Each structure stands twice: as C-alpha cells, then as structure tokens.
From Swiss-Prot, chain B:
Domain Ig-like: 2-101, 110-206
Subunit comment: Immunoglobulins are composed of two identical heavy chains and two identical light chains; disulfide-linked. Interacts with FCGR1A; this interaction mediates IgG effector functions on monocytes. Interacts with FCGR2A and FCGR3A.
Noted disease: Multiple myeloma: A malignant tumor of plasma cells usually arising in the bone marrow and characterized by diffuse involvement of the skeletal system, hyperglobulinemia, Bence-Jones proteinuria and anemia. Complications of multiple myeloma are bone pain, hypercalcemia, renal failure and spinal cord compression. The aberrant antibodies that are produced lead to impaired humoral immunity and patients have a high prevalence of infection. Amyloidosis may develop in some patients.
Gene name linked to the record: IGHG1
Range within the parent protein: 120 to 328 of 399
Name of protein: Immunoglobulin heavy constant gamma 1
Listed GO CC annotations: blood microparticle; extracellular exosome; extracellular region; extracellular space; IgG immunoglobulin complex; immunoglobulin complex, circulating; plasma membrane
GO biological process: adaptive immune response; antibacterial humoral response; antibody-dependent cellular cytotoxicity; B cell receptor signaling pathway; complement activation, classical pathway; complement-dependent cytotoxicity
Organism for this UniProt entry: Homo sapiens
C-alpha cells in the first residue's frame, strides 16, 4: 500500500446556481516525504483537459503528504453526467492510479417541499422549531436555506439526505426562532435548490395562520409587477406595457 | 498492512436490560502469509477475558477479516467506561490499539414532538407523519413508530444532527396511506434514550374533529338515529336498515 487517490464531487449548491463555480477535487494521501512529487492528468469523458489548479502540499499527522488538485467543471457538463477522471503518477507507484467520478445515474425526481409549524407542546418553550420536509428527490445532491422577509435566517440545521424505501431521498431542515417572532405572524420561507425543479428552485412559506403567508406572497408579487410596469414605462412599449398591466391585474 | 475498526453497541441494546450490548473489533486486510491475530481487551486499563472471536473470512482480495465481539454490562457502557481493543499480528511492527467509550458530557432528556402532515401533502395518496426528537445528549438513541401496538414498517429516521446549543436532534418520518390518517387512526412515535425515565417515552398523533366539527357530527348522529329508529319501527328492507345502521355507527366512531 503506497499512496491512495480519492475523488470528491462539487458542492451541490455550486452545480445548481450558474453564479457559482463547481469543482471536482482529487486528493492523494500517504505520499512519502522520500518521493513527494505527484503529477495529475485530468480527463473529461476520456478527453484530457489542462485547466486544473494544484494546491500546495500539506503535512499529514503520519509524517506523509496530502496533495490536492482542483478541476473547475461546466454546470451543464456535470448535470449531463460527464465522467471526470483523475490519473495520479508518483515514483513510489508501480503504475499510475486512476479514479473516476460523475453525478449519480438514475431517473431524476422532483423534490416535494412541505413546511410544518411548531408542535402545540413546543409553544410552552422560549424558542420554537419550524420544520421543512423535502422528500421524493433524486439524486441526493440538494441545497436548503431559510429566509424571513427576503433575508437569510442563520439559526437552522439540515439533516443529511436519507434513502427512502422507494429509492428516492428525503431530509428535514429545522429553523429555530424566538417564540415572539412566530407569534407576531412573521412569514418564514424554506428555499430548496435541486436539478429536477423548474429553474432549479422552489420555496414554501409558513406563518402562524393559514392564508396570511399566501396573502403576503400575493402582495409581494403585486409590488414587484408594479415596479416592473413603472420600470418599462420609465424605460420607454405600449403593447408590452399593456401585457404587463394584465399580469399585475392577474 | 491490516486495519482495525472498533464499533460501539447498538443504542437499543444498551437501554433495554433484556438485550446484550456488545463492542465489535474488526481487523481487515490480514495476509494469509501471517494470518494469526491475537485480541486483548481492556476496560478502563484493566484486561478482561470474556471476548468471543468469530472464525476468519477470506475476503475477495485473498486477505482475511477477523472479528472479536466483547459483551459489556449496560451500566459499564452508560457510566462511560473506556473499552480498548489491542490487535497483535506478526505482519505488524507493533500492536494496534483502538479505544471507544460513550460520549462524555451532561446527559440531556430528549423532547419528543409529533407533527401532522402539511396541508399541501393531503392532495397526494400517501402522507408523512413527522416526529421531531431534540435537545438530547449523548447522540445514542432509538426511534420507532407504532399503530395499535404493532410496529409500522414504512418509516425511516435521520441520523442525529448536532444542534447549535451542543445537543442533538433528529426526525423520524412515517409514511401512511392518506385514508388511514383521515379515518382518525392513532399513530405513536416511541423513543428510547438513557436520559428518559425507564429509558422510554411515547408521543401519539391523530386526526380528531374540532369544536365546531364535533357539533355538526353530533347533529348528524341525532338525525341518522331518528332515521334508523324510524325505519326499524316501520318495516323497510333489512338492506336499507343495514346501510343506514352502518352509516350511524361510522358517524359515532368519528367522535
């Protein structure tokens, strides 16, 4: 047993938002101080590529080196299921080691997002738990955050994806808030990114009483469409502005 | 060379006195060149001799996997005693020593909360009953669902997640046909943890009618009772009586 090669996929969030840079990471561990040089060759569907960045080596606790190579990938390439291969050469190896990685294969399935208010039993406590169930998704690569009035909530934790009996995945995200914020009728939003959602995005809202969050969302859309009409009017025209006035009325 | 893993007892086995908690020491990648392996077990530095070694299982890569299982006392494990597995093998420069114990820290009682299905989910054929278990320490816990004193078989539980206050939470999701939920069946989320009285608690969850819905139900019961008594006092088909009596019984059941 000489050096070992491990290959890690991009962060789920990075593959789904076009604004972010998804990268595959090739980690070589148990590199001897004797022969600590490592050459990486990268291949995309068998075709060699040259855009990989090499990180500086790091000392492991067992007085060996860990060496990392990071390859930027195209959103579409990763999601289309292109195979990424890392070939590692080192003098302490009889031959180069190859590892391969790609997105999980299988019929992608759209996540169903369900918000759950606090248990009546939990309303005795000073903090309450807002629950978001995300279920029936494939593959397991997913991102969940919480918002309140278009601003990120930071006091939440998400479970890892769990394999369901039907071969899809589910998880739960738990947002903790002061009971006062809940009782005041604030609207909280569970926001989910996944490859199988329209625009890779959905959100579900949740508040102390039923139609209040639905009414709130409708008013927000009215505001934005009003700004859109005002915008197009200040910009210039008449046909397109009329169509946007029909949207506002809807 | 060979690698040693040490695994703790199943949480349910440490909590029920009827069950046998065991620590498992697994050695993998043992060469059939030097395939003899001696296990020494220590409880808080003190060697013990009650360990049962399983046979030897030639792996696909023509190496051996050897497993040693040490039965532990419920009390010893929960009191946080350290269990050490020392593995000696001629292909090793020195013996490999691995240690395991229950997490150290103030044990904290889990709070159990059942959550009915999202209104949005009641459009679908199956619904999710949710059990939130939070504020527990340490992470060792067991969660099952029951209905009418029988394990429900379509549920999964998440791994314990570390909360921002240093305690753990998880969720257990029971999937049921929406019919079973709608018809007012009681489901129970059952939790075992060292910090619970009797290492056990249960929380139930069902559909029942509100205050206003109960009133309407009582009115229908009255009228259908009059209708049934009417048809019985009169002579109408046992058919029609059967149908009407069945409806009346179903109404009463909903209360």
């Amino acid at each position: 047993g000489g050096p070992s090669v491990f290959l890690f996929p991009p962060k789920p969030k990075d593959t789904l938002m076009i604004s972010r840079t998804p990268e595959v990471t090739c980690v070589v561990v148990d590199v001897s101080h004797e022969d600590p040089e490592v050459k990486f060759n990268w291949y995309v569907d068998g075709v060699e590529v040259h855009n990989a960045k090499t990180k500086p080596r790091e000392e492991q606790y067992n007085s060996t080196y860990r060496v990392v190579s990071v390859l930027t990938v195209l959103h579409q390439d990763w999601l289309n299921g292109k195979e990424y291969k890392c070939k590692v050469s080192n003098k302490a190896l009889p031959a180069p080691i190859e590892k391969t990685i790609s997105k999980a294969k299988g019929q992608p399935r759209e996540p169903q997002v369900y918000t759950l208010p606090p248990s009546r039993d939990e309303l005795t406590k000073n903090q309450v738990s807002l629950t978001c169930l995300v279920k029936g998704f494939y593959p397991s690569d997913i991102a969940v955050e919480w918002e309140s009035n278009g601003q990120p909530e930071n006091n939440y934790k998400t479970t890892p994806p769990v394999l369901d009996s039907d071969g899809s995945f589910f998880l739960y995200s738990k947002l903790t808030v002061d009971k006062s914020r809940w009782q005041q009728g604030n609207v909280f939003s569970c926001s989910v990114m996944h490859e199988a959602l329209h625009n890779h995005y959905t959100q579900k809202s949740l508040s102390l009483s039923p139609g209040k969050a639905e009414r709130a969302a409708l008013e927000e859309l009215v505001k934005l469409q009003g700004e859109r009409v005002r915008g197009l009017k200040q910009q210039k025209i008449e046909e397109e502005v009329a169509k946007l006035l029909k949207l506002k009325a809807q």
